[PDB]
Curated annotation (Swiss-Prot), chain A:
The keyword Isomerase does not apply. It comes from Saccharomyces cerevisiae (strain ATCC 204508 / S288c) (Baker's yeast). This is T-complex protein 1 subunit eta. GO terms for cellular component: chaperonin-containing T-complex; cytoplasm. Its main location: cytoplasm. Molecular chaperone; assists the folding of proteins upon ATP hydrolysis. Known to play a role, in vitro, in the folding of actin and tubulin. In yeast may play a role in mitotic spindle formation. It is found in: Cytoplasm.
Swiss-Prot record, chain B:
GO terms for biological process: chaperone mediated protein folding independent of cofactor; protein folding. NCBIfam families: chap_CCT_epsi, thermosome_alpha, thermosome_beta. GO terms for cellular component: chaperonin-containing T-complex. Its main location: cytoplasm. Molecular chaperone; assists the folding of proteins upon ATP hydrolysis. Known to play a role, in vitro, in the folding of actin and tubulin. In yeast may play a role in mitotic spindle formation. The keyword Repeat does not apply. This is T-complex protein 1 subunit epsilon. It is found in: Cytoplasm. PANTHER family: CHAPERONIN.
UniProtKB/Swiss-Prot annotation, chain C:
Present with 5530 molecules/cell in log phase SD medium. CDD domains: TCP1_delta. NCBIfam families: chap_CCT_delta, thermosome_alpha, thermosome_beta. The gene is CCT4. GO terms for biological process: chaperone mediated protein folding independent of cofactor; protein folding. Belongs to the TCP-1 chaperonin family. Gene3D superfamilies: GroEL, GroEL-like equatorial domain, TCP-1-like chaperonin intermediate domain. It comes from Saccharomyces cerevisiae (strain ATCC 204508 / S288c) (Baker's yeast). This is T-complex protein 1 subunit delta.
Length: 488, 502, 479
């Protein structure tokens, strides 16, 4: 009967109370000792629930929805269980008053339809603001990079970091594929972003300035190593190998070793450019840039290995001419070059730019973003209380308890961080209802603040998928009046 | 959330209370019994904590940290556990007052960083004082750990062995001493005065057939001594005496062309294999472990030869000579492989008249080699023995009134927790812990700021600066960081979950 | 022998922690149900410990400490119990370190004497010649009582009453000489000092009683006018009184026989001798002091030299009151006393009004022994701990650690004040120590003040209490 539901509520609370301190990056961790005697410690709730393997069906239901939250999304594994468990506590006193469990399940479903509608409204999507793929992400890195020595030049630096991930496919983002090399000399704000692959000048031999740097219709050719007059494992044999480059009409030759002076003289009259001593990581990125392939010898070169970009030019950046690839929209990876008066100064700025790239990387994958830090969580609970006037009747008190159940997420975040959950909830609602609704809770020092001002954002699909998973799993537990466990 | 905070403090206190009496040179020993029936007695906390097998979730963190302390430092075994329990006892009083546990964790982290900057001003330099005074610290480094044992009579001999061994295996660039590059080997029997320092791997061998010479000839002024490293066994080709003998003549040509004096293999040899190697003056070496082959190529600057066809003269290990030297009255008659050039690895040779003396000397030498690494890595050092903890206490307590807020009480509890070590050393020395603690604080304020510690072993007087008792600063700095790192992980886990035994 | 002391400290700590919740007006009230079925509710620490009937022998000493707390200082009966338990709670860790209680007991007496001089240097120096601070001290202390607007006129009446008996070097003055007579009727606005004396009862309501006499003698007489022909026996009784010209007769109240026969009323009416009967036994010792007379058991012991002097003895006409007053005792040997009449319509008025004046006279008397006042609210408890922080480093030996634990036990009082007010315990205490670098005693603008004797006696009594607790190493049955 109805008594079995009460037993299932305490089963979800017992699992919740263990996962309450685990909410948040600074929250507590659970130490589980398996019967195998191997002891592991994990922050994420998935692995925590996988080691328990609870036989109870209602507690196991929270484990299944937690594994799907960590698989298809990867974030919100702990929050989906706390929200689903706390929702069970609000429905506990309703059964004692005679309210059937059916309208309790259907009452929460009506609140979800009103909650999801407000999520898209609280989200930030700019159209008519006359922006682009950079200025939106450039501002987010500003404040994170603010209060630094480069703050004066910080406006120019945010352009090269955002355009790094925009030059390649927005569906697959990898920070390791973007190389960064330091260029000694020059002003820091005069650095330019390169769409292709760039590297330094490794030629130590005389005879430079013998080749043109501007090609109208260049061709990309990949040959591992020939490029030698004398084998480093005959003059006519090398001339026949260099003739294959002339037969295919390729003005670009790249290798991982140095190039002898014989190739530079033969490539002068044919306007063919060649660069030796190229790093192994650079050769793989050039192949992915033009979408070609490398051939071992010069005889087996196939015609489809050739490729062309918009324009090639050799810039004077750093009082030295460096190779770079510009105007390649098909390049799967870019390369960044920084300028500065010293190599140690660039290294300190280079490491600071990696943090700004990782922030805008997760924002590009998911274009639906809502304001975090209790902002969205407080607005959803407030709107359900105002719209409940037409929900009046037994369905009103059900949704009113759902709005209070949404306050458990910011609670544990403040309790695990040391803040007082009693005072922070009273001062937040006053600043949220009066004036602007964007005022959140600061995670560092307890005070009222705007998360939209601090540019700390959270993806909305984490909360949307967790809200439907917490409600769907709740309707399954509230609908079970009897549980029979067979032995075997 | 209710009984967890109270149980975690009492569980870690009872386990840490075991080694509180063993801290210091006067710390009392204990009787440990292995599951095989062997009785061992030692004062080292690493041996006592490692042998503990328990299901308590809180006490398992002491074993996980103690494994990393032996490699990094090795002296932070007993000291850190007692210091970590002091932070937990002071945190228990704060939990009852309503202090948040993470604030206690973050309060000890900020208090530890402030105490490091205070000792940076009062520390002194070694090499700036003199060059030979640095070596005097290395000679007396092992004397402190060996002063409580019978080894303290011959201690002057073991002091010079650790000085020349670290210089070869450690370069002043990285200033790192790898434990894998130091081979610790010892046997029962003999005495402790016959211990010698070897610049390379020992690799004891009986030289197979007795007709083989016990020494390696230079072979007409040849360069060094070439040795062959084989990772494959020596057998005739298979998917009769003259058939296998003719096949052995083809494989031995790779040794003659490369010019290897001694042949080393991982597997045993046949009887006819030693017959051809005897007339060619090629001593055979069989039954060599896999890990022993790594020490051969590092000391002799050799390479690993996977197969017989890959054997070359450039991959042969080069040494000075290989001879068999009798050690004491032992009938094993081990051998010595020397170098005469600086290698990247050494092997420690320690002997003793008792099985316990050998094990106690190897572990004491391990901690002695780590102190030399910290003295070279950091020239600035401080005077320990109770003087460092009192200095850190007065520094944090003075800055506690200057920092307002909740952290004001976090600094007071952190300063009182630092007083546990000098009081424990005072208790372990048989003196009043409170009466002695007030004496050390009075001499460092009204008179002048200096380092005066508690004497565990009977000495002439106080002020160890006169007796030249030095401790590494980075060694003591690593201890206070692991103590705060361990104290947080205990507070960061409020949950206890364990299953049954089927 | 430690098992006897540790059992008494834990038993006494549970009593101190139970009373700790009653500190302050917002504190938690404790309920005690007597075996007879009576249930009392109040926050008074002296009432709870008295009606608790503690069987623990050492814990009964807290009643004697709370009794001397109200008798000397007059305030802090709950705070002295908290401070006593704070030292007992801190002494638990002292015994675990191997410290003998003698050093623990001897260090508390030395720390209590040094804590007095620290408070005197930080205290504001005031004098009794300035009536500005004397009126504001008693007026703000009555804000916790039913009297509000009428409390303004009650303050100067209590100030001028103490200044007459305070003198200069008299120091402690007995509070039993101040008698507050409560009576139904009248109001609070009507007050009369009547420095001569005031009785507790009315006069003869029968026919023939003059009820008023001018220039009469007053004396204590334990005799009684009763029959054993009867008028002849009562005539010699009234004739011997006429020999000494005693026109005011005071008979001790006794339920054995009556006071004055109706036949003797007509005899004393012609002689104009006023009679006041039903004199309580408590007033027998009171009238023998201010009036300078002596109790007279028999008729032969009655003499003229033991009789006082009274200017005018009259019965004031009032609604449901009829209070008799005497002025001009004219006695050089006996010092004057203050007896104030309390009037009001409701019985609950004159009751709490008498108790409210008790706390007002004690605080004023605190300035008589030691002048100066210290602002309450945890200021003196924290200020002492601030001075003992740097002083603890100057000590040596076992006592050096005691100074640190002594200042830690003093923080319990300001911590409880923050808990009973609903505010965060630690957070409020940290805000007080943070501003301590600038402000010192600053509560002054809130008109909340406390005398120095309360904070001084609370430390002195708690230091000797805990000292005597650790002196009992055994509990034996001796009958």
């Amino acid at each position: 009967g109805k008594g079995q539901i009460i037993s299932n509520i305490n089963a979800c609370v017992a699992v919740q109370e263990a996962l309450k301190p685990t909410l948040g990056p600074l929250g507590s961790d659970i130490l589980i000792v398996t019967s195998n005697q191997k002891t592991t410690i994990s922050n994420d709730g998935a692995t925590i629930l996988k080691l328990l393997d609870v036989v109870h069906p209602a507690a196991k239901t929270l484990v299944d929805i937690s594994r799907a939250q960590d698989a298809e999304v990867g974030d919100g594994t702990t929050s989906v269980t706390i929200l689903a468990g706390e929702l069970m506590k609000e429905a506990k006193p309703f059964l004692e008053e005679g309210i059937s469990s059916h309208l309790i399940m259907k009452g929460y479903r009506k609140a979800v339809s009103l909650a999801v509608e407000k999520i898209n409204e609280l989200a930030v999507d700019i159209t008519s603001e006359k922006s682009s793929g950079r200025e939106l992400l450039e501002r987010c890195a500003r404040t994170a990079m603010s209060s630094k020595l480069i703050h004066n030049n910080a406006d120019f630096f945010v352009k090269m970091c955002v355009d790094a991930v925009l030059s390649l496919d927005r569906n697959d983002l990898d920070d390791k594929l973007i190389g960064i090399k330091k260029i000694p000399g020059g002003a820091m704000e005069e650095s330019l972003f390169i769409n292709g692959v760039a590297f330094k000048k490794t030629f130590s031999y005389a005879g430079f300035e013998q080749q043109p740097k501007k090609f109208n219709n260049p061709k990309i050719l990949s040959l591992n190593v020939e490029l030698e007059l004398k084998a480093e494992d005959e003059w006519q044999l090398i001339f026949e190998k260099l003739r294959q480059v002339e037969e295919t009409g390729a003005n670009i030759v790249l290798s991982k070793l140095p190039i002898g002076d014989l190739a530079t003289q033969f490539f002068a009259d044919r306007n063919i450019f060649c660069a030796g001593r190229v790093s192994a990581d650079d050769m793989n990125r050039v192949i992915q840039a033009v979408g070609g392939s490398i051939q071992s010898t010069t005889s087996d070169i196939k015609p489809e290995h050739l490729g062309t970009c918009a324009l090639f030019e050799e810039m004077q950046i750093g009082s030295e001419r460096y190779n770079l690839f510009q105007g390649c929209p098909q390049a799967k990876t870019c390369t960044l070059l920084l300028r500065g008066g010293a190599e140690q100064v660039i290294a300190e700025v280079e490491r600071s730019l990696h943090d700004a790239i990782m922030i805008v990387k997760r924002a590009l994958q998911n274009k639906l973003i809502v304001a975090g830090g209790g902002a969205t969580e407080m607005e959803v609970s407030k709107c359900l209380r105002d719209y409940s006037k037409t929900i009046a009747g037994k369905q009103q008190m059900i949704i009113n308890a759902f709005a209070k159940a949404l306050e458990v997420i910011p609670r544990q975040l403040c309790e695990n961080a040391g803040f007082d959950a009693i005072e922070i909830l009273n001062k937040l609602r006053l600043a949220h209802s009066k004036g602007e609704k964007w005022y959140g809770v600061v995670f560092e020092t307890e005070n009222i603040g705007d998360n939209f001002a601090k540019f700390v954002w959270e993806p909305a699909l984490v909360k949307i998928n967790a809200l439907n998973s917490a409600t769907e799993a709740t309707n399954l537990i509230l609908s079970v009046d009897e549980t029979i466990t067979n032995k075997g | 959330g209710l009984e967890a905070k109270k149980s975690h403090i009492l569980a870690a206190r009872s386990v840490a209370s075991i080694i509180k009496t063993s801290l210091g040179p006067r710390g009392l020993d204990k009787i440990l019994i292995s599951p095989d029936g062997e009785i061992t007695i030692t004062n080292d906390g690493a041996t006592i904590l490692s042998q503990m097998e328990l299901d308590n979730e809180i006490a398992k963190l002491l074993v996980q940290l103690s494994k990393s302390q032996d490699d990094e430092i090795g002296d932070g075994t007993t000291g850190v556990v007692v210091l970590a329990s002091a932070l937990l006892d002071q945190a228990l009083e704060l939990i009852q007052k309503g202090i948040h546990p993470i604030k206690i964790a973050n309060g000890f982290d900020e208090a530890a960083k402030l105490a490091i900057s205070k000792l940076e001003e009062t520390c002194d330099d070694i090499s700036a004082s003199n060059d030979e005074l640095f070596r005097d610290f290395l000679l007396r480094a092992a004397k402190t750990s060996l002063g409580s044992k019978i080894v303290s009579k011959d201690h002057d001999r073991f002091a010079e062995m650790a000085v020349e061994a670290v210089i070869n295996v450690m370069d002043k660039d990285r200033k790192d001493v790898d434990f894998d590059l130091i081979k610790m080997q010892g046997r029962v029997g003999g005495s402790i005065s016959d211990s010698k320092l070897i610049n390379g791997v020992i690799l004891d061998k009986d030289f197979s057939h007795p007709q083989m010479p016990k020494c390696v000839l230079p072979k007409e002024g040849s360069d060094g001594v070439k040795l062959a490293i084989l990772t494959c066994p020596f057998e005739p080709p298979k998917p009769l005496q003259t058939y296998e003998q003719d096949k052995f003549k083809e494989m031995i040509d790779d040794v003659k062309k490369a010019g290897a004096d001694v042949v080393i293999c991982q597997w045993g040899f046949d009887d006819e294999a030693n017959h051809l190697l005897l007339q060619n003056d090629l001593p055979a070496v069989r039954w060599v472990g896999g890990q022993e082959l790594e020490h051969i190529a590092i000391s002799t600057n050799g390479r690993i030869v996977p197969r017989f066809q890959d054997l070359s003269k450039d991959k042969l290990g080069t040494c000075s000579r290989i001879y068999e030297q009798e050690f004491g009255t032992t009938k094993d008659r081990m051998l010595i492989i020397e170098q005469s050039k600086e290698t990247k690895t050494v092997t420690c040779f320690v002997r003793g008249s008792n099985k316990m003396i050998v094990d106690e000397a190897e572990r004491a030498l391990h901690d002695s080699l780590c102190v030399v690494r910290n003295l070279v890595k950091d020239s600035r050092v401080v005077y320990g023995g109770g003087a460092a903890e009192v200095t850190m206490s007065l520094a944090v307590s003075e800055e506690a009134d200057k920092q307002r807020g909740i952290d004001q009480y976090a600094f007071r509890g952190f300063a009182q927790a630092l007083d546990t070590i000098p009081m424990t050393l005072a208790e372990n020395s048989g003196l009043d812990p409170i009466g002695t603690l007030s004496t050390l604080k009075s001499k460092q304020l009204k008179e002048k700021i200096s380092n005066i510690g508690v004497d565990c072993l009977g000495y002439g007087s106080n002020d160890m600066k006169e007796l030249f008792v030095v401790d590494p600063f980075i060694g003591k700095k690593q201890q206070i960081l692991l103590a705060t790192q361990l104290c947080r992980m205990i507070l960061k886990i409020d949950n206890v979950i364990i299953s049954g035994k089927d | 022998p430690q098992e006897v002391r540790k059992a008494n400290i834990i038993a006494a700590r549970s009593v101190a922690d139970a009373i700790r919740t009653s500190l302050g007006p917002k504190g938690m009230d404790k309920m005690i149900k007597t075996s007879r079925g009576e249930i009392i509710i109040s926050n008074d620490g002296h009432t709870i410990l008295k009606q608790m009937a503690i069987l623990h022998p050492v814990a009964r000493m807290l009643v004697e400490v709370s009794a001397a707390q109200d008798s000397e200082a007059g305030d802090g009966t709950t705070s002295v119990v908290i401070l006593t338990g704070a030292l007992l709670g801190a002494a638990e860790r002292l015994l675990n370190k191997g410290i003998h209680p003698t050093i623990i007991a001897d260090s508390f007496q030395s720390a209590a004497k040094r804590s007095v001089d620290i408070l005197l240097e930080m205290c504001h120096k005031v004098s009794l010649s300035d009536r500005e601070q004397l009126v504001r001290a008693a007026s703000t202390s009555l804000s916790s009582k039913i009297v509000s607007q009428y409390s303004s006129f009650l303050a100067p009446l209590a100030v001028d009453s103490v200044l007459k008996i305070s003198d200069e070097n008299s120091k402690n003055v007995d509070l039993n000489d101040i008698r507050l007579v409560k009576k139904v009727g009248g109001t609070i606005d009507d007050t009369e000092m009547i420095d001569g004396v005031v009785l507790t009862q009315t006069a003869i309501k029968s026919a023939g009683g003059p009820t008023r006499k001018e220039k009469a003698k007053i004396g204590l007489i334990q005799f009684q006018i009763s029959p054993p022909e009867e008028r002849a026996y009562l005539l010699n009784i009234c004739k011997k009184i006429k020999k000494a010209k005693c026109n005011v007769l005071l008979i001790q109240k006794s339920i054995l026989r009556d006071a004055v026969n109706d036949l003797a009323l007509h005899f004393l009416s012609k002689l104009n001798i006023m009679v006041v009967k039903d004199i309580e036994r408590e007033e027998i010792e009171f009238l023998s002091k201010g009036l300078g007379c002596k109790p007279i058991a028999d008729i032969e012991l009655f003499t003229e030299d033991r009789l006082g002097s009274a200017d005018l003895v009259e019965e004031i006409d009032s609604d449901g009151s009829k209070i008799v007053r005497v002025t001009g005792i004219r006695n050089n040997n006996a010092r004057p006393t203050v007896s104030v009449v309390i009037r009001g319509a409701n019985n609950m008025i004159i009751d709490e009004t008498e108790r409210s004046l008790h706390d007002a006279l004690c605080v004023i008397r605190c300035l008589v022994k030691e002048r100066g006042l210290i602002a309450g609210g945890g200021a003196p408890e924290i200020e002492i701990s601030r001075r003992l922080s740097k002083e603890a480093r100057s000590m040596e030996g076992v006592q050096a650690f005691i100074w640190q634990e002594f200042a830690s036990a003093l923080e319990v009082i300001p911590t409880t004040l923050a808990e009973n007010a609903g505010l965060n315990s630690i957070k409020v205490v940290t805000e007080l120590r943070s501003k301590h670098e600038n402000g010192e005693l600053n509560t002054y603008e809130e008109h909340i003040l406390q005398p120095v004797l309360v904070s001084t006696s609370a430390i002195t009594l708690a230091s000797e209490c805990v000292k005597s607790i650790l002196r009992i190493d055994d509990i034996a049955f001796s009958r």
